[PDB]
A and B are shown apart, each in its own frame.
With several copies, the nearest count.
Chain A
């Protein structure tokens, strides 16, 4: 019922987004061996990538939903999107 429940990571330029976003990480070199678990949530390009992948591939399975007894002639293939989602089950879905 509230719009955001945090104005310190939902806002652009907030401390969380600047700390864990890659677009604002360019001004500060860092140890790449430190794997940030929150580096998959606040970054613009990666969450755009996950949203467009999920939307285009739910569109793919909605194309492939109907049986070919009633729908048109088309191959059916999983398209490796599930294998790209296995690692990213809270990161495709962004859900944490």
Chain B
């Protein structure tokens, strides 16, 4: 239990907004029994350069809590234990099909201003909760923006970004503007580049043959699309096992790049789909 106290008296509109906002994950860095206005939420970091991946890294470092039982200016945050059941109100604009794993993502800046809190040069920046599929999708897009923006053209950076950025998952359009192009993608691409070099050097003889053998036997239309992208074996089988194991491990590494740690596992969903129950903590 972490009690928050803002030291500043809030109005009835503020207590109505927090009553609307009850049962939401808020991350804290402090790990004390007491927190205040300075450490609550994500505003004490989102003034430093506003970089999405920077917020993502420190948000990985943060310690997550659940809002509970606001008694006026005092604000209970439960520290939720491992694998126990907890009720979460959602903020991500999604339809939230049950049983999927959930991660915790930096807030994608919508054009409309937030109505959560703005009080005395301090807002309540709440990070969103998303499914792991669209989380990995966003991380793919981050890595891809760096792969393209290491390459340099004039009036083509905008041509890549405006086509790529607006994505749709479960009838929801989101976008990520103003990428600073830091070297974050360069390191997290550099180990990918290393691993793709290893996939090249360690990939077996069966597999790139397996394309041509599959195509020369039979054909399918998605195989013809893969062909568009494309354009003796005398008992070496333990070597083949080892090479396929190495290629699989490189794919595990590049998957561990774009993967985000699942923070929640959904069991029951309300019909309004504002609150859902989970049984997980990392």
Contacts and interface: CB of A to CB of B under 8 A. Distances in A.
A3 interface: no
Contacts of A52: 121
Contact of B222 (A29, A45, A56, A79): A29
Nearest to A80: B35
Interface string B218-245: 0011100000000000000000000000
Q: Secondary structure at chain A's binding surface: helix, strand, loop or mixed?
A: loop
Contacts of B7: 79-80
Q: Secondary structure at chain B's binding surface: helix, strand, loop or mixed?
A: loop
Contacts of A75: 9
A27 interface: yes
Interface residues of A, number: 9
Interface string B115-129: 000001100000000
Nearest to A79: B7
Given A75-B9, A79-B7, A27 B35 contact: no
B146 to A, nearest CB: 16
Interface string B1-16: 0000001110000000
Contact of A27 (B38, B48, B120, B220): B220
Interface in A36-58: 45, 52, 56
Nearest to B225: A29
A82 to B, nearest CB: 13
Nearest to B9: A75
Contacts of A79: 7-8
A73 to B, nearest CB: 12
A56 B120 contact: yes
Contact of B221 (A28, A45, A56, A80): A28
B246 to A, nearest CB: 14
A28 B220 contact: yes
A36 to B, nearest CB: 16
Interface in A1-36: 27-29
Interface of B: 7-9, 35, 38, 48, 120-121, 220-222
- Nearest 4 A/B pairs, CB to CB: A29-B222, A27-B220, A79-B7, A28-B221
Interface of A: 27-29, 45, 52, 56, 75, 79-80
Given A28-B221, A29-B222, 15 more contacts: A27-B220, A27-B221, A28-B220, A28-B222, A29-B220, A29-B221, A45-B48, A52-B121, A56-B120, A75-B9, A79-B7, A79-B8, A80-B7, A80-B35, A80-B38
